[PDB]
Amino acid sequence: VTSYTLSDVVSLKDVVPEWVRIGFSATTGAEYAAHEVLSWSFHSELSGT
Amino acid sequence: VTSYTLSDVVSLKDVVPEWVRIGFSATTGAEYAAHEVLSWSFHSELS
Amino acid sequence: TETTSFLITKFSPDQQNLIFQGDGYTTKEKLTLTKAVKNTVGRALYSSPIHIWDRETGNVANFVTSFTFVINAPNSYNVADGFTFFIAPVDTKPQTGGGYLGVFNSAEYDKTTETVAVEFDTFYNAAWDPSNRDRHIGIDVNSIKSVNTKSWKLQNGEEANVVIAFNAATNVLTVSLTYP
Amino acid sequence: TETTSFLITKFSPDQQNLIFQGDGYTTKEKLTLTKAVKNTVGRALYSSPIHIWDRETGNVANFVTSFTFVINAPNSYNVADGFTFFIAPVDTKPQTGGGYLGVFNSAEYDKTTETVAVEFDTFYNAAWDPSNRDRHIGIDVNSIKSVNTKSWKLQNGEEANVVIAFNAATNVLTVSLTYP
Ligand SMILES: OC[C@H]1O[C@H](O)[C@@H](O)[C@@H](O)[C@@H]1O
Ligand SMILES: OC[C@H]1O[C@H](O)[C@@H](O)[C@@H](O)[C@@H]1O
Ligand SMILES: [Ca+2]
Ligand SMILES: [Ca+2]
Ligand SMILES: [Mn+2]
Ligand SMILES: [Mn+2]
């Protein structure tokens, strides 16, 4: 059980739009590997204050 | 507080496709009214 | 195992997770399907496809939805046509208007349509609607002629709180409407 | 209040609530973004747009996502380019490949991209990657030069379980990866 953790401040409001799409990307170039996803879950919530 | 209830067996597996869209519709013809929804929530789970 | 869920407690002018058809549109606060005008249709769909059942397992989903709606007729005696919550194919487009609520095209069972709808019908159509001529709740499977109905007294201008639930083990669909 | 949620524990051959781009495809049980082939791009998006902030209230969403991914390189020491979870405009399409991970175009901050990404970078690109030459986790904001990174030792063929989360009150994005 090897665990890594990174954390920072991203002010979403100033970078992305109100409505977004989220997802995954993977690429190869001169070197390569297969990239695979097995499970995914997402939950978000926004207030109307 | 006034309420109404209805229940019936529906064999969804023999009527709709595996992947569906859900939603609302409303119509008027020779007669009419405004039809509006104020809030909506949904939850489904397949195993 | 697959879950889909969402909650919208107030609709916005830019409700981009919905798909509008016909005259359906969102405003500040409300989702408007039809204004009070003649021969009109409005539909609004959640943008994401739902996996309601599965081939390899034969598994079927359990789901529940809840919504508040308001019908507003300028003449409380001439009220038509009604409202539905439906489950249809991914490529679903509006069907016949007026008495067919924008989801069915006939009163004979039609396997093609692949739509189950829960209707809140305000207008008696002699050809398929209940003999008592009452406004009613109904469960529709591939036909505008409901498999089951219950008389409902329309409270004009009032908010109706609906909860529709489907239990996969029993295949029972339950509808409940409550006024304050 | 607006909520969007979903759970996919095992992928189906027809997975209609995702949008595929490049060579992205699903099969029974997994989503394959790229096969082990040179010069390729795979992307997979969730169908519905997500409301992540509101200009009118000024509010921002709290969100949490988690996924299990496998990287499988046939030459275990020559591995490239990586994988990212990203957040971008609704109309997002594949950007530059190779070291740009299909999500960016530049190693300079570009206000036009409107994309935040969390990268699991497996190939050292001298023009912008950590001088320590280690494979790394990183937080990218409109640039392929990450704002912050962490060295990570890849386990080939092993399941990483990742959780990413964003706190609306503090604006901190937390990333954790775990191998068994
Ligand atoms: O695949 C490794 C490497 O291959 C090439 O040198 C380029 O396409 C780079 O962008 C990429 O990072
Ligand atoms: O609007 C009430 C009624 O008007 C006409 O008679 C037709 O459009 C019907 O289908 C509809 O039900
Ligand atoms: Ca009718
Ligand atoms: Ca790199
Ligand atoms: Mn009827
Ligand atoms: Mn990097």
Side-chain angles (χ1 to χ4, degrees), chain C residues 83-143:
Chain C
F83 170 83
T84 50
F85 163 84
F86 62 90
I87 296 156
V90 161
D91 41 68
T92 181
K93 300 156 202 186
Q95 306 299 264
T96 308
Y100 296 97
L101 306 177
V103 285
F104 297 111
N105 295 303
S106 70
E108 293 167 287
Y109 190 104
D110 175 20
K111 205 178 182 177
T112 298
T113 311
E114 303 171 273
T115 312
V116 169
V118 169
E119 63 171 54
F120 300 93
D121 189 337
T122 55
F123 190 85
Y124 174 71
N125 297 102
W128 56 74
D129 278 336
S131 194
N132 51 38
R133 290 154 104 123
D134 281 330
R135 291 184 185 119
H136 55 279
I137 298 172
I139 296 178
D140 300 349
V141 182
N142 294 158
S143 174

Short mmCIF file of all heavy atoms in Angstrom, two decimals, chain C residues 83-143:
data_model
loop_
_atom_site.label_atom_id
_atom_site.label_comp_id
_atom_site.label_asym_id
_atom_site.label_seq_id
_atom_site.Cartn_x
_atom_site.Cartn_y
_atom_site.Cartn_z
N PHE C 83 -49.73 16.63 -19.11
CA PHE C 83 -48.31 16.53 -18.84
C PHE C 83 -47.83 15.09 -18.60
O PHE C 83 -48.54 14.27 -18.03
CB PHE C 83 -48.12 17.47 -17.66
CG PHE C 83 -46.80 17.48 -16.91
CD1 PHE C 83 -45.73 18.22 -17.37
CD2 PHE C 83 -46.69 16.74 -15.75
CE1 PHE C 83 -44.55 18.21 -16.67
CE2 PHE C 83 -45.51 16.73 -15.06
CZ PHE C 83 -44.45 17.46 -15.52
N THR C 84 -46.65 14.72 -19.04
CA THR C 84 -46.09 13.40 -18.71
C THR C 84 -44.62 13.43 -18.26
O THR C 84 -43.86 14.36 -18.58
CB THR C 84 -46.04 12.38 -19.86
OG1 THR C 84 -45.44 13.09 -20.92
CG2 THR C 84 -47.36 11.85 -20.35
N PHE C 85 -44.23 12.43 -17.48
CA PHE C 85 -42.83 12.07 -17.30
C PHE C 85 -42.63 10.81 -18.14
O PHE C 85 -43.39 9.85 -18.00
CB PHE C 85 -42.49 11.70 -15.85
CG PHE C 85 -41.17 10.94 -15.65
CD1 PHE C 85 -39.99 11.63 -15.54
CD2 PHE C 85 -41.18 9.55 -15.57
CE1 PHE C 85 -38.82 10.92 -15.37
CE2 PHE C 85 -40.00 8.85 -15.39
CZ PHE C 85 -38.81 9.53 -15.30
N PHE C 86 -41.65 10.74 -19.01
CA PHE C 86 -41.51 9.56 -19.82
C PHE C 86 -40.08 9.08 -19.87
O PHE C 86 -39.13 9.80 -19.53
CB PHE C 86 -42.01 9.79 -21.27
CG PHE C 86 -41.26 10.83 -22.04
CD1 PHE C 86 -40.16 10.48 -22.80
CD2 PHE C 86 -41.64 12.15 -21.96
CE1 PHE C 86 -39.44 11.45 -23.47
CE2 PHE C 86 -40.92 13.12 -22.63
CZ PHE C 86 -39.82 12.78 -23.38
N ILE C 87 -40.05 7.82 -20.28
CA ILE C 87 -38.87 7.00 -20.50
C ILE C 87 -39.00 6.52 -21.94
O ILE C 87 -39.93 5.80 -22.31
CB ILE C 87 -38.90 5.80 -19.52
CG1 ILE C 87 -38.81 6.32 -18.10
CG2 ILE C 87 -37.77 4.85 -19.83
CD1 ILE C 87 -39.39 5.35 -17.09
N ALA C 88 -38.10 6.97 -22.78
CA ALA C 88 -38.16 6.67 -24.20
C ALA C 88 -36.78 6.33 -24.76
O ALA C 88 -35.81 6.36 -24.00
CB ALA C 88 -38.69 7.90 -24.92
N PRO C 89 -36.59 5.97 -26.04
CA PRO C 89 -35.28 5.69 -26.61
C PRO C 89 -34.37 6.91 -26.56
O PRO C 89 -34.83 8.06 -26.50
CB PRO C 89 -35.56 5.29 -28.03
CG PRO C 89 -36.87 4.58 -27.85
CD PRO C 89 -37.63 5.47 -26.92
N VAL C 90 -33.07 6.70 -26.65
CA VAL C 90 -32.11 7.81 -26.63
C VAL C 90 -32.38 8.90 -27.68
O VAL C 90 -32.44 10.10 -27.40
CB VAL C 90 -30.73 7.14 -26.79
CG1 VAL C 90 -29.63 8.08 -27.24
CG2 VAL C 90 -30.36 6.63 -25.41
N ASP C 91 -32.75 8.48 -28.88
CA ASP C 91 -33.02 9.37 -30.01
C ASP C 91 -34.45 9.92 -30.04
O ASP C 91 -34.99 10.32 -31.07
CB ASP C 91 -32.73 8.62 -31.32
CG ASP C 91 -33.20 7.17 -31.31
OD1 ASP C 91 -34.41 6.93 -31.30
OD2 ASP C 91 -32.35 6.28 -31.27
N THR C 92 -35.10 9.91 -28.89
CA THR C 92 -36.47 10.36 -28.80
C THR C 92 -36.70 11.78 -29.26
O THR C 92 -35.96 12.70 -28.92
CB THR C 92 -36.98 10.19 -27.37
OG1 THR C 92 -38.32 10.64 -27.41
CG2 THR C 92 -36.11 10.88 -26.31
N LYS C 93 -37.68 11.89 -30.15
CA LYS C 93 -38.15 13.17 -30.71
C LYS C 93 -39.65 13.30 -30.48
O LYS C 93 -40.30 12.26 -30.30
CB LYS C 93 -37.88 13.23 -32.22
CG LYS C 93 -36.43 13.10 -32.70
CD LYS C 93 -36.47 12.60 -34.14
CE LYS C 93 -35.13 11.94 -34.53
NZ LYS C 93 -35.08 11.59 -35.94
N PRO C 94 -40.27 14.49 -30.50
CA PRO C 94 -41.70 14.65 -30.26
C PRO C 94 -42.59 13.83 -31.18
O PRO C 94 -42.26 13.60 -32.35
CB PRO C 94 -41.95 16.11 -30.40
CG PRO C 94 -40.64 16.72 -30.01
CD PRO C 94 -39.68 15.79 -30.76
N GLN C 95 -43.65 13.23 -30.63
CA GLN C 95 -44.63 12.50 -31.42
C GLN C 95 -45.91 13.33 -31.60
O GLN C 95 -45.83 14.59 -31.61
CB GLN C 95 -44.94 11.19 -30.72
CG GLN C 95 -43.69 10.38 -30.43
CD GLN C 95 -42.94 9.98 -31.68
OE1 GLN C 95 -43.11 8.88 -32.20
NE2 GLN C 95 -42.09 10.74 -32.32
N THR C 96 -47.11 12.73 -31.69
CA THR C 96 -48.29 13.55 -31.96
C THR C 96 -48.69 14.38 -30.75
O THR C 96 -48.61 13.96 -29.60
CB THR C 96 -49.55 12.73 -32.38
OG1 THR C 96 -49.21 11.86 -33.44
CG2 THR C 96 -50.63 13.64 -32.94
N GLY C 97 -49.05 15.63 -31.04
CA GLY C 97 -49.45 16.62 -30.05
C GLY C 97 -50.88 16.46 -29.55
O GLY C 97 -51.45 15.36 -29.55
N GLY C 98 -51.45 17.58 -29.09
CA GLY C 98 -52.79 17.59 -28.53
C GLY C 98 -53.06 16.43 -27.58
O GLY C 98 -52.33 16.20 -26.62
N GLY C 99 -54.01 15.58 -27.92
CA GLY C 99 -54.40 14.50 -27.03
C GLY C 99 -53.36 13.44 -26.84
O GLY C 99 -53.48 12.64 -25.92
N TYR C 100 -52.32 13.38 -27.69
CA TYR C 100 -51.28 12.34 -27.55
C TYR C 100 -50.07 12.74 -26.71
O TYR C 100 -49.06 12.04 -26.63
CB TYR C 100 -50.79 11.89 -28.90
CG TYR C 100 -51.87 11.22 -29.70
CD1 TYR C 100 -52.57 11.94 -30.63
CD2 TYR C 100 -52.16 9.89 -29.49
CE1 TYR C 100 -53.56 11.33 -31.36
CE2 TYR C 100 -53.15 9.27 -30.21
CZ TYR C 100 -53.84 9.99 -31.14
OH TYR C 100 -54.84 9.38 -31.87
N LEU C 101 -50.17 13.91 -26.08
CA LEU C 101 -49.20 14.43 -25.10
C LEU C 101 -47.75 14.56 -25.58
O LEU C 101 -46.84 14.89 -24.81
CB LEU C 101 -49.30 13.54 -23.82
CG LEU C 101 -50.71 13.37 -23.18
CD1 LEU C 101 -50.67 12.44 -21.99
CD2 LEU C 101 -51.21 14.72 -22.73
N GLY C 102 -47.55 14.42 -26.90
CA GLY C 102 -46.23 14.54 -27.49
C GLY C 102 -45.39 13.29 -27.35
O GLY C 102 -44.23 13.31 -27.72
N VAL C 103 -45.95 12.19 -26.86
CA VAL C 103 -45.18 10.95 -26.69
C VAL C 103 -45.74 9.73 -27.39
O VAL C 103 -45.04 8.74 -27.57
CB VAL C 103 -45.01 10.53 -25.21
CG1 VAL C 103 -43.97 11.45 -24.62
CG2 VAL C 103 -46.30 10.60 -24.40
N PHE C 104 -47.03 9.71 -27.71
CA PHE C 104 -47.60 8.57 -28.44
C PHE C 104 -48.20 9.01 -29.76
O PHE C 104 -48.32 10.21 -30.01
CB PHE C 104 -48.67 7.87 -27.59
CG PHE C 104 -48.04 7.29 -26.33
CD1 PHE C 104 -48.35 7.84 -25.10
CD2 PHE C 104 -47.11 6.28 -26.43
CE1 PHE C 104 -47.72 7.38 -23.97
CE2 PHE C 104 -46.48 5.82 -25.30
CZ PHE C 104 -46.79 6.37 -24.07
N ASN C 105 -48.46 8.06 -30.65
CA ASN C 105 -49.10 8.44 -31.92
C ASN C 105 -50.43 7.73 -32.14
O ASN C 105 -51.16 8.06 -33.07
CB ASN C 105 -48.23 8.12 -33.13
CG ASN C 105 -46.98 8.95 -33.15
OD1 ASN C 105 -46.98 10.18 -33.14
ND2 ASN C 105 -45.85 8.27 -33.13
N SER C 106 -50.79 6.78 -31.31
CA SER C 106 -52.09 6.12 -31.45
C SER C 106 -52.58 5.54 -30.15
O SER C 106 -51.85 5.54 -29.15
CB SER C 106 -52.06 4.95 -32.43
OG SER C 106 -51.33 3.83 -31.92
N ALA C 107 -53.81 5.03 -30.18
CA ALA C 107 -54.42 4.37 -29.03
C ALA C 107 -54.29 2.85 -29.05
O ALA C 107 -54.73 2.14 -28.15
CB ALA C 107 -55.88 4.76 -28.98
N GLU C 108 -53.73 2.30 -30.12
CA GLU C 108 -53.41 0.88 -30.17
C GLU C 108 -51.97 0.64 -29.78
O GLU C 108 -51.11 1.42 -30.19
CB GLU C 108 -53.53 0.30 -31.52
CG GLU C 108 -54.92 0.26 -32.03
CD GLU C 108 -54.83 -0.05 -33.50
OE1 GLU C 108 -54.43 0.85 -34.26
OE2 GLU C 108 -55.12 -1.18 -33.88
N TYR C 109 -51.73 -0.41 -28.99
CA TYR C 109 -50.39 -0.76 -28.55
C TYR C 109 -49.37 -0.87 -29.69
O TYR C 109 -49.52 -1.58 -30.68
CB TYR C 109 -50.48 -2.07 -27.77
CG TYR C 109 -49.22 -2.48 -27.02
CD1 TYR C 109 -49.19 -2.30 -25.66
CD2 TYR C 109 -48.14 -3.03 -27.69
CE1 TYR C 109 -48.06 -2.67 -24.95
CE2 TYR C 109 -47.00 -3.40 -26.98
CZ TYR C 109 -46.98 -3.22 -25.62
OH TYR C 109 -45.87 -3.59 -24.88
N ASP C 110 -48.28 -0.17 -29.54
CA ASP C 110 -47.29 -0.13 -30.58
C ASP C 110 -45.88 -0.38 -30.06
O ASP C 110 -45.19 0.55 -29.63
CB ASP C 110 -47.47 1.22 -31.21
CG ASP C 110 -46.48 1.63 -32.28
OD1 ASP C 110 -45.80 0.79 -32.89
OD2 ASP C 110 -46.42 2.83 -32.50
N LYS C 111 -45.36 -1.61 -30.18
CA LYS C 111 -44.03 -1.97 -29.64
C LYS C 111 -42.83 -1.08 -30.07
O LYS C 111 -41.90 -0.79 -29.33
CB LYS C 111 -43.76 -3.43 -30.02
CG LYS C 111 -42.77 -4.04 -29.03
CD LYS C 111 -42.47 -5.52 -29.31
CE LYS C 111 -41.52 -6.09 -28.24
NZ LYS C 111 -41.26 -7.51 -28.44
N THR C 112 -42.96 -0.48 -31.27
CA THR C 112 -41.99 0.43 -31.91
C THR C 112 -41.61 1.59 -31.03
O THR C 112 -40.45 1.93 -30.90
CB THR C 112 -42.54 1.11 -33.20
OG1 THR C 112 -42.82 0.06 -34.11
CG2 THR C 112 -41.61 2.11 -33.87
N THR C 113 -42.64 2.18 -30.42
CA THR C 113 -42.48 3.43 -29.67
C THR C 113 -41.56 3.26 -28.47
O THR C 113 -40.78 4.16 -28.15
CB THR C 113 -43.88 3.97 -29.23
OG1 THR C 113 -44.74 3.95 -30.37
CG2 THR C 113 -43.85 5.41 -28.78
N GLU C 114 -41.57 2.10 -27.81
CA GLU C 114 -40.64 1.81 -26.70
C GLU C 114 -40.58 2.83 -25.56
O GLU C 114 -39.58 3.06 -24.88
CB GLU C 114 -39.22 1.60 -27.25
CG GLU C 114 -39.14 0.49 -28.29
CD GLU C 114 -37.82 0.41 -29.01
OE1 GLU C 114 -37.65 1.10 -30.02
OE2 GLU C 114 -36.95 -0.35 -28.57
N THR C 115 -41.74 3.43 -25.35
CA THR C 115 -41.98 4.46 -24.35
C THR C 115 -43.02 4.05 -23.31
O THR C 115 -44.13 3.58 -23.60
CB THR C 115 -42.52 5.79 -24.92
OG1 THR C 115 -41.70 6.11 -26.01
CG2 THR C 115 -42.48 6.97 -23.96
N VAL C 116 -42.60 4.23 -22.07
CA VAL C 116 -43.46 4.15 -20.89
C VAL C 116 -43.67 5.59 -20.38
O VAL C 116 -42.70 6.34 -20.21
CB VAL C 116 -42.77 3.29 -19.81
CG1 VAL C 116 -43.49 3.40 -18.47
CG2 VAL C 116 -42.74 1.85 -20.30
N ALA C 117 -44.88 6.08 -20.19
CA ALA C 117 -45.08 7.44 -19.73
C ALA C 117 -46.02 7.48 -18.55
O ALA C 117 -46.91 6.64 -18.44
CB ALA C 117 -45.70 8.29 -20.79
N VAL C 118 -45.85 8.40 -17.63
CA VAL C 118 -46.85 8.60 -16.58
C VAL C 118 -47.57 9.88 -16.93
O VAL C 118 -46.95 10.95 -16.97
CB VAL C 118 -46.19 8.71 -15.19
CG1 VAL C 118 -47.18 9.19 -14.13
CG2 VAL C 118 -45.69 7.34 -14.78
N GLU C 119 -48.86 9.82 -17.26
CA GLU C 119 -49.57 11.04 -17.66
C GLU C 119 -50.41 11.70 -16.59
O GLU C 119 -50.86 11.05 -15.64
CB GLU C 119 -50.47 10.77 -18.82
CG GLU C 119 -51.56 9.77 -18.47
CD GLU C 119 -52.62 9.62 -19.54
OE1 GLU C 119 -52.27 9.35 -20.67
OE2 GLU C 119 -53.79 9.76 -19.23
N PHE C 120 -50.58 12.99 -16.73
CA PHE C 120 -51.44 13.80 -15.88
C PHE C 120 -52.34 14.48 -16.92
O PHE C 120 -52.02 15.50 -17.54
CB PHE C 120 -50.59 14.81 -15.07
CG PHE C 120 -49.57 14.10 -14.18
CD1 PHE C 120 -48.29 13.87 -14.64
CD2 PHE C 120 -49.92 13.64 -12.92
CE1 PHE C 120 -47.38 13.15 -13.89
CE2 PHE C 120 -49.00 12.91 -12.18
CZ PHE C 120 -47.73 12.66 -12.66
N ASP C 121 -53.42 13.79 -17.22
CA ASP C 121 -54.31 14.14 -18.32
C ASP C 121 -55.49 15.00 -17.89
O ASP C 121 -56.33 14.63 -17.06
CB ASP C 121 -54.75 12.82 -18.95
CG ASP C 121 -55.52 12.85 -20.27
OD1 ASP C 121 -56.13 13.88 -20.58
OD2 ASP C 121 -55.53 11.84 -20.99
N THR C 122 -55.57 16.19 -18.50
CA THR C 122 -56.60 17.16 -18.15
C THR C 122 -57.79 17.25 -19.11
O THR C 122 -58.81 17.90 -18.85
CB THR C 122 -55.99 18.56 -18.03
OG1 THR C 122 -55.33 18.82 -19.24
CG2 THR C 122 -54.99 18.67 -16.91
N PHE C 123 -57.74 16.50 -20.20
CA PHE C 123 -58.74 16.58 -21.23
C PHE C 123 -59.25 15.22 -21.63
O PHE C 123 -58.46 14.33 -21.96
CB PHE C 123 -58.18 17.24 -22.48
CG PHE C 123 -59.25 17.57 -23.51
CD1 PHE C 123 -59.95 18.77 -23.41
CD2 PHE C 123 -59.47 16.70 -24.56
CE1 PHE C 123 -60.89 19.10 -24.36
CE2 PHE C 123 -60.41 17.03 -25.51
CZ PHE C 123 -61.13 18.21 -25.40
N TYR C 124 -60.58 15.08 -21.65
CA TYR C 124 -61.19 13.81 -22.01
C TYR C 124 -61.21 13.64 -23.52
O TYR C 124 -61.77 14.45 -24.26
CB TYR C 124 -62.63 13.73 -21.40
CG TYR C 124 -63.42 12.50 -21.83
CD1 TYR C 124 -63.10 11.23 -21.38
CD2 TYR C 124 -64.44 12.66 -22.77
CE1 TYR C 124 -63.79 10.13 -21.88
CE2 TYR C 124 -65.12 11.57 -23.27
CZ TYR C 124 -64.78 10.33 -22.81
OH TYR C 124 -65.46 9.27 -23.34
N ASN C 125 -60.57 12.60 -23.99
CA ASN C 125 -60.60 12.23 -25.39
C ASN C 125 -61.40 10.95 -25.49
O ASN C 125 -60.96 9.85 -25.09
CB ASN C 125 -59.20 11.96 -25.95
CG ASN C 125 -58.28 13.17 -25.93
OD1 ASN C 125 -57.44 13.23 -25.06
ND2 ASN C 125 -58.31 14.16 -26.81
N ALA C 126 -62.63 11.10 -25.98
CA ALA C 126 -63.61 10.03 -26.08
C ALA C 126 -63.14 8.66 -26.53
O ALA C 126 -63.50 7.62 -26.00
CB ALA C 126 -64.70 10.50 -27.01
N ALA C 127 -62.18 8.68 -27.44
CA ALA C 127 -61.66 7.45 -28.02
C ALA C 127 -60.84 6.48 -27.17
O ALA C 127 -60.75 5.31 -27.51
CB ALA C 127 -60.81 7.80 -29.21
N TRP C 128 -60.18 6.98 -26.12
CA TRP C 128 -59.31 6.15 -25.26
C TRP C 128 -59.33 6.56 -23.77
O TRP C 128 -58.95 5.77 -22.92
CB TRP C 128 -57.83 6.21 -25.74
CG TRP C 128 -57.24 7.62 -25.85
CD1 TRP C 128 -56.90 8.30 -24.71
CD2 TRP C 128 -57.06 8.40 -26.98
NE1 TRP C 128 -56.54 9.48 -25.10
CE2 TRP C 128 -56.62 9.59 -26.44
CE3 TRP C 128 -57.20 8.31 -28.36
CZ2 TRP C 128 -56.31 10.68 -27.24
CZ3 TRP C 128 -56.90 9.40 -29.17
CH2 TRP C 128 -56.46 10.57 -28.60
N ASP C 129 -59.78 7.78 -23.43
CA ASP C 129 -59.79 8.21 -22.04
C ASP C 129 -60.93 7.63 -21.20
O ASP C 129 -62.01 7.36 -21.74
CB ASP C 129 -59.80 9.73 -21.99
CG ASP C 129 -58.43 10.36 -22.16
OD1 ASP C 129 -57.41 9.73 -21.88
OD2 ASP C 129 -58.34 11.52 -22.55
N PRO C 130 -60.78 7.49 -19.86
CA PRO C 130 -61.78 6.92 -18.97
C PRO C 130 -63.19 7.48 -19.10
O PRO C 130 -63.44 8.69 -19.11
CB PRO C 130 -61.26 7.14 -17.57
CG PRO C 130 -59.80 7.31 -17.74
CD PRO C 130 -59.70 8.07 -19.05
N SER C 131 -64.08 6.50 -19.11
CA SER C 131 -65.52 6.67 -19.26
C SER C 131 -66.14 7.68 -18.31
O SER C 131 -67.05 8.41 -18.68
CB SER C 131 -66.14 5.31 -19.07
OG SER C 131 -67.48 5.09 -19.45
N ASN C 132 -65.59 7.85 -17.10
CA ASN C 132 -66.11 8.86 -16.19
C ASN C 132 -65.87 10.32 -16.56
O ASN C 132 -66.36 11.22 -15.88
CB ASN C 132 -65.57 8.64 -14.79
CG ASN C 132 -64.07 8.49 -14.66
OD1 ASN C 132 -63.25 9.11 -15.30
ND2 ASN C 132 -63.61 7.63 -13.81
N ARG C 133 -65.09 10.56 -17.63
CA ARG C 133 -64.74 11.89 -18.15
C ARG C 133 -63.95 12.79 -17.20
O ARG C 133 -63.79 14.00 -17.39
CB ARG C 133 -66.04 12.59 -18.61
CG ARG C 133 -66.49 11.85 -19.86
CD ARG C 133 -67.97 11.87 -20.23
NE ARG C 133 -68.21 12.77 -21.33
CZ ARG C 133 -68.79 12.41 -22.47
NH1 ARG C 133 -69.16 11.17 -22.75
NH2 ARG C 133 -68.98 13.34 -23.38
N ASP C 134 -63.39 12.17 -16.17
CA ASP C 134 -62.58 12.86 -15.19
C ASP C 134 -61.15 13.11 -15.61
O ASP C 134 -60.59 12.40 -16.45
CB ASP C 134 -62.52 12.08 -13.90
CG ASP C 134 -63.73 12.18 -13.00
OD1 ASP C 134 -64.41 13.22 -13.00
OD2 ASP C 134 -63.97 11.22 -12.27
N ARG C 135 -60.52 14.14 -15.00
CA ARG C 135 -59.08 14.32 -15.15
C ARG C 135 -58.42 13.22 -14.35
O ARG C 135 -58.96 12.75 -13.34
CB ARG C 135 -58.65 15.67 -14.64
CG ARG C 135 -59.23 16.61 -15.63
CD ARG C 135 -58.79 17.97 -15.28
NE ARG C 135 -59.45 18.88 -16.19
CZ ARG C 135 -60.28 19.82 -15.73
NH1 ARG C 135 -60.52 19.95 -14.43
NH2 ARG C 135 -60.87 20.66 -16.56
N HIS C 136 -57.31 12.71 -14.82
CA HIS C 136 -56.77 11.52 -14.20
C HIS C 136 -55.27 11.38 -14.31
O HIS C 136 -54.60 12.02 -15.12
CB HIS C 136 -57.46 10.27 -14.85
CG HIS C 136 -57.34 10.22 -16.37
ND1 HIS C 136 -58.11 10.92 -17.19
CD2 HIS C 136 -56.38 9.55 -17.11
CE1 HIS C 136 -57.68 10.72 -18.39
NE2 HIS C 136 -56.65 9.90 -18.34
N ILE C 137 -54.73 10.57 -13.43
CA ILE C 137 -53.36 10.11 -13.50
C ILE C 137 -53.41 8.82 -14.29
O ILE C 137 -54.42 8.11 -14.26
CB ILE C 137 -52.82 9.85 -12.07
CG1 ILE C 137 -52.83 11.14 -11.28
CG2 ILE C 137 -51.38 9.37 -12.12
CD1 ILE C 137 -52.50 10.96 -9.79
N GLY C 138 -52.39 8.49 -15.05
CA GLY C 138 -52.39 7.22 -15.76
C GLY C 138 -51.00 6.65 -16.06
O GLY C 138 -50.00 7.36 -16.16
N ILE C 139 -50.91 5.34 -16.21
CA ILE C 139 -49.66 4.70 -16.58
C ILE C 139 -49.76 4.21 -18.02
O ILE C 139 -50.63 3.37 -18.32
CB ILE C 139 -49.37 3.54 -15.63
CG1 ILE C 139 -49.16 4.06 -14.23
CG2 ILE C 139 -48.11 2.84 -16.07
CD1 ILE C 139 -48.90 2.96 -13.18
N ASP C 140 -48.94 4.75 -18.92
CA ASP C 140 -48.99 4.43 -20.34
C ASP C 140 -47.84 3.59 -20.88
O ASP C 140 -46.66 3.93 -20.81
CB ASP C 140 -49.03 5.70 -21.18
CG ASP C 140 -50.17 6.70 -21.03
OD1 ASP C 140 -51.17 6.41 -20.38
OD2 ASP C 140 -50.06 7.79 -21.59
N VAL C 141 -48.12 2.42 -21.42
CA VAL C 141 -47.10 1.60 -22.04
C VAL C 141 -47.34 1.41 -23.55
O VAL C 141 -48.22 0.64 -23.96
CB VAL C 141 -47.06 0.28 -21.29
CG1 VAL C 141 -45.99 -0.60 -21.85
CG2 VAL C 141 -46.77 0.51 -19.83
N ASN C 142 -46.62 2.12 -24.42
CA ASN C 142 -46.73 2.04 -25.89
C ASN C 142 -48.11 2.30 -26.52
O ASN C 142 -48.41 1.93 -27.66
CB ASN C 142 -46.26 0.70 -26.39
CG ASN C 142 -44.77 0.49 -26.18
OD1 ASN C 142 -44.28 -0.63 -26.15
ND2 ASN C 142 -43.92 1.48 -26.00
N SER C 143 -48.90 3.07 -25.79
CA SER C 143 -50.25 3.42 -26.20
C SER C 143 -50.73 4.63 -25.46
O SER C 143 -50.38 4.78 -24.30
CB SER C 143 -51.24 2.32 -25.89
OG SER C 143 -52.56 2.73 -26.18
#
